[PDB]
Scaffold this active site. Structure first.
Site, PDB file in Angstrom:
ATOM      1  N   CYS A  92       0.845  -1.193   0.000  1.00 24.16           N
ATOM      2  CA  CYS A  92       0.000   0.000   0.000  1.00 24.16           C
ATOM      3  C   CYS A  92       0.878   1.239   0.000  1.00 24.16           C
ATOM      4  O   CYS A  92       2.032   1.183   0.417  1.00 24.16           O
ATOM      5  CB  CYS A  92      -0.947   0.048   1.201  1.00 24.16           C
ATOM      6  SG  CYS A  92      -2.114   1.428   1.004  1.00 24.16           S
ATOM      7  N   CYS A 137      -4.826   0.543  10.074  1.00 25.39           N
ATOM      8  CA  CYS A 137      -4.975  -0.429   8.986  1.00 25.39           C
ATOM      9  C   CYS A 137      -4.999  -1.875   9.491  1.00 25.39           C
ATOM     10  O   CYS A 137      -4.078  -2.318  10.194  1.00 25.39           O
ATOM     11  CB  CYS A 137      -3.831  -0.252   7.989  1.00 25.39           C
ATOM     12  SG  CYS A 137      -3.926  -1.403   6.639  1.00 25.39           S
ATOM     13  N   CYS A 190      -2.454   4.524   6.921  1.00 25.68           N
ATOM     14  CA  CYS A 190      -3.528   4.707   7.894  1.00 25.68           C
ATOM     15  C   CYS A 190      -3.171   3.999   9.192  1.00 25.68           C
ATOM     16  O   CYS A 190      -2.793   2.824   9.186  1.00 25.68           O
ATOM     17  CB  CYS A 190      -4.832   4.154   7.331  1.00 25.68           C
ATOM     18  SG  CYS A 190      -5.155   4.743   5.648  1.00 25.68           S
TER      19      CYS A 190
HETATM   20  N1  LIG Z   1      -9.028  -1.160  11.474  1.00 25.41           N
HETATM   21  C1  LIG Z   1     -10.090  -1.072  10.567  1.00 25.41           C
HETATM   22  N2  LIG Z   1     -11.371  -1.167  10.948  1.00 25.41           N
HETATM   23  C2  LIG Z   1     -12.373  -1.088  10.078  1.00 25.41           C
HETATM   24  N3  LIG Z   1     -12.173  -0.902   8.785  1.00 25.41           N
HETATM   25  C3  LIG Z   1     -10.914  -0.808   8.331  1.00 25.41           C
HETATM   26  C4  LIG Z   1      -9.825  -0.879   9.209  1.00 25.41           C
HETATM   27  N4  LIG Z   1      -8.671  -0.747   8.484  1.00 25.41           N
HETATM   28  C5  LIG Z   1      -9.005  -0.575   7.233  1.00 25.41           C
HETATM   29  N5  LIG Z   1     -10.368  -0.610   7.098  1.00 25.41           N
HETATM   30  C6  LIG Z   1     -11.166  -0.473   5.865  1.00 25.41           C
HETATM   31  O1  LIG Z   1     -11.151  -1.722   5.149  1.00 25.41           O
HETATM   32  C7  LIG Z   1     -11.354  -1.459   3.738  1.00 25.41           C
HETATM   33  C8  LIG Z   1     -10.343  -2.279   2.913  1.00 25.41           C
HETATM   34  S1  LIG Z   1      -8.641  -1.741   3.312  1.00 25.41           S
HETATM   35  C9  LIG Z   1      -7.742  -2.003   1.754  1.00 25.41           C
HETATM   36  C10 LIG Z   1      -8.448  -1.368   0.546  1.00 25.41           C
HETATM   37  C11 LIG Z   1      -7.917   0.035   0.187  1.00 25.41           C
HETATM   38  N6  LIG Z   1      -6.477   0.154   0.460  1.00 25.41           N
HETATM   39  C12 LIG Z   1      -8.691   1.082   0.948  1.00 25.41           C
HETATM   40  O2  LIG Z   1      -8.205   1.700   1.860  1.00 25.41           O
HETATM   41  O3  LIG Z   1      -9.953   1.354   0.607  1.00 25.41           O
HETATM   42  C13 LIG Z   1     -11.203   0.070   3.542  1.00 25.41           C
HETATM   43  O4  LIG Z   1     -12.487   0.682   3.387  1.00 25.41           O
HETATM   44  C14 LIG Z   1     -10.538   0.530   4.866  1.00 25.41           C
HETATM   45  O5  LIG Z   1     -10.868   1.876   5.196  1.00 25.41           O
HETATM   46  S1  SF4 Z   2      -6.582   1.137   5.070  1.00 23.24           S
HETATM   47 FE1  SF4 Z   2      -4.567   0.087   4.955  1.00 23.24          FE
HETATM   48  S2  SF4 Z   2      -4.513  -0.776   2.854  1.00 23.24           S
HETATM   49 FE2  SF4 Z   2      -6.157   0.912   2.785  1.00 23.24          FE
HETATM   50  S3  SF4 Z   2      -5.145   2.875   2.267  1.00 23.24           S
HETATM   51 FE3  SF4 Z   2      -5.008   2.660   4.517  1.00 23.24          FE
HETATM   52  S4  SF4 Z   2      -2.985   1.642   4.952  1.00 23.24           S
HETATM   53 FE4  SF4 Z   2      -3.590   1.241   2.786  1.00 23.24          FE
END
Ligand SMILES: Nc1ncnc2c1ncn2[C@@H]1O[C@H](CSCC[C@H](N)C(=O)O)[C@@H](O)[C@H]1O
Ligand code: SF4
Ligand SMILES: O=c1ccn([C@@H]2O[C@H](COP(=O)(O)OP(=O)(O)OP(=O)(O)O)[C@@H](O)[C@H]2O)c(=O)[nH]1
Ligand SMILES: [Cl-]
Ligand SMILES: [Cl-]
Ligand SMILES: [Cl-]
Length: 290
Positions: free
Chosen positions: A14, A21, A18
Site C-alpha cells: 500500500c 490499517c 492509515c
Molecule cells: N481497522 C479497521 N477497521 C475497520 N475498517 C478498516 C480498518 N482498516 C481498514 N479498514 C477499511 O477496510 C477497507 C479495505 S482496506 C484495503 C483497501 C484500500 N487500500 C482502501 O483503503 O480502501 C477500507 O475501506 C478501509 O478503510
Molecule cells: S486502510 Fe490500509 S490498505 Fe487501505 S489505504 Fe489505509 S494503509 Fe492502505
C-alpha cells in the site's frame, strides 16, 4: 458454506499509512495473473456471485493493469453478477475507466474524513492532493463511465464527532459503508503487528452517536465490530481464507492447493451475520438506476 460474496486481497502493498490499517504490508507476494484467474474460476464453480478486489491498495499492482485484467476476466469470462473494488483512490486514472470501467459494477473509495487535518492524523495520504476534489473527480468519472459509486468510512477517535451529511450527499453514492474501527491481532494489535490501532478505537456508544447523526443519509450501511468481524469471506494474497474468529487472521490452505470446499471449512464465516449486515443486495450495475 457457499462462497457467495468473497473479498480477494491480492496484494498487501500500500502507498498510504492509515494508523488503524487491519490488512498490513506483511508480504510482497502476489499471485501470477494466470493463477489468480484459476482460483477465481474455482470460486465461480463453487457458487461465487460477487467478487471484491482489495488489499493492500489494489491499483498498485502492475500500475493498475493487474486489477483491470482481473475485473474484465470476472465480468466477461466468468460472467460474475458483481465485480467490485475497494480502493484508497490515490492511483485511479481516467484511462483505467476507459479500458476497464465497462466491466466494473461498483467502485468503493475509502474516505474517513472531509477534513485535511484529520486525514493527516489518520495517515490517509500526504496532503498533496485536494482530496475532496479527487473524490468528486472519481465520482464524476463513475458517472461518465457508468460505474456505481460507493464510499467506505472507518469511524475512529479522530472523526467520531464529524458531521459528514452534506459531503456524503454531495457525492450521491449508491452505498455508504460506515465501519467501527476494528482491532485485529497480528495486523493492528500485538507485538507481531505493523500497526497499533488501540488509540483509534471508539466505544459502541460513540459509534452509535455517529450513526444517529447521519440518519438522513439513505445509503448508509453500518457495521459495528460485531457485524464486521466474521461476516466476510476473505482470501489473502495466496488465496487462503483468513479466519477472523480468533481475533487474528489465521489462514487456511490455498484454494489453489486443496480446493474451495476444503479451504473454506476453516474460514470461520458467519453467514447469518453476513445477511444481517446487509451483505446481499442489488449489486449488479445493470440492475441499478445510475
Ligand atoms: N481497522 C479497521 N477497521 C475497520 N475498517 C478498516 C480498518 N482498516 C481498514 N479498514 C477499511 O477496510 C477497507 C479495505 S482496506 C484495503 C483497501 C484500500 N487500500 C482502501 O483503503 O480502501 C477500507 O475501506 C478501509 O478503510
Ligand atoms: S486502510 Fe490500509 S490498505 Fe487501505 S489505504 Fe489505509 S494503509 Fe492502505
Ligand atoms: O475483519 C475483517 C473484515 C473485513 N475486512 C475487509 O474489509 C473490507 C470491507 O470493505 P467492504 O465492506 O466494502 O467490502 P464488500 O465489497 O465485500 O462489501 P459489500 O458492499 O459487498 O457489503 C473488505 O475488503 C473485507 O475483506 C477485513 O480485512 N477484515
Ligand atoms: Cl459458471
Ligand atoms: Cl496526497
Ligand atoms: Cl451496526
Amino acid at each position: 458454506t457457499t462462497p457467495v460474496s468473497v473479498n480477494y486481497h491480492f496484494t498487501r502493498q500500500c502507498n498510504y499509512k492509515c494508523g488503524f490499517c487491519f490488512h498490513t504490508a506483511k508480504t510482497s507476494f502476489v499471485l501470477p495473473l494466470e493463477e489468480a484467474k484459476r482460483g477465481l474460476l474455482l470460486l465461480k464453480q463453487a457458487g461465487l456471485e460477487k467478487i471484491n478486489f482489495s488489499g493492500g491498495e489494489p491499483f498498485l499492482q502492475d500500475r493498475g493493469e493487474y486489477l483491470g485484467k482481473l475485473v474484465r476476466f470476472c465480468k466477461e469470462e466468468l460472467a460474475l453478477p458483481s465485480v467490485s473494488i475497494v480502493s484508497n483512490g490515490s492511483l485511479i486514472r481516467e484511462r483505467w475507466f476507459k479500458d476497464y470501467g465497462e466491466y466494473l459494477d461498483i467502485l468503493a473509495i475509502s474516505c474517513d474524513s472531509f477534513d485535511e487535518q484529520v486525514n493527516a492524523l489518520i495517515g490517509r495520504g500526504q496532503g498533496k492532493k485536494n482530496h475532496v476534489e479527487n473524490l468528486q473527480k472519481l465520482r464524476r468519472w463513475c458517472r461518465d463511465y457508468k460505474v456505481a459509486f460507493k464510499i467506505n468510512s472507518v469511524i475512529n477517535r479522530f472523526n467520531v464527532d464529524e458531521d459528514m451529511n452534506e459531503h456524503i450527499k454531495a457525492l450521491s453514492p449508491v452505498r455508504w459503508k460506515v465501519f467501527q474501527c476494528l482491532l485485529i491481532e497480528g495486523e493492528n494489535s500485538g507485538a507481531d503487528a505493523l500497526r497499533a490501532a488501540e488509540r483509534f478505537l471508539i466505544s459502541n456508544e460513540e459509534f452509535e452517536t455517529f450513526l444517529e447523526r447521519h440518519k438522513e443519509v439513505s445509503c448508509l450501511v453500518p457495521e459495528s465490530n460485531q457485524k464486521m468481524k466474521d461476516s466476510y469471506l476473505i482470501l489473502d494474497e495466496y488465496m487462503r481464507f483468513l479466519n477472523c474468529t480468533g481475533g487474528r487472521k489465521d489462514p487456511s490452505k490455498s484454494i489453489l492447493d486443496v480446493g474451495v470446499e476444503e479451504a473454506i471449512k476453516f474460514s470461520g464465516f458467519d453467514e447469518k451475520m453476513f445477511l444481517k449486515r446487509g451483505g446481499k443486495y442489488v449489486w449488479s450495475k445493470a440492475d441499478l438506476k445510475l
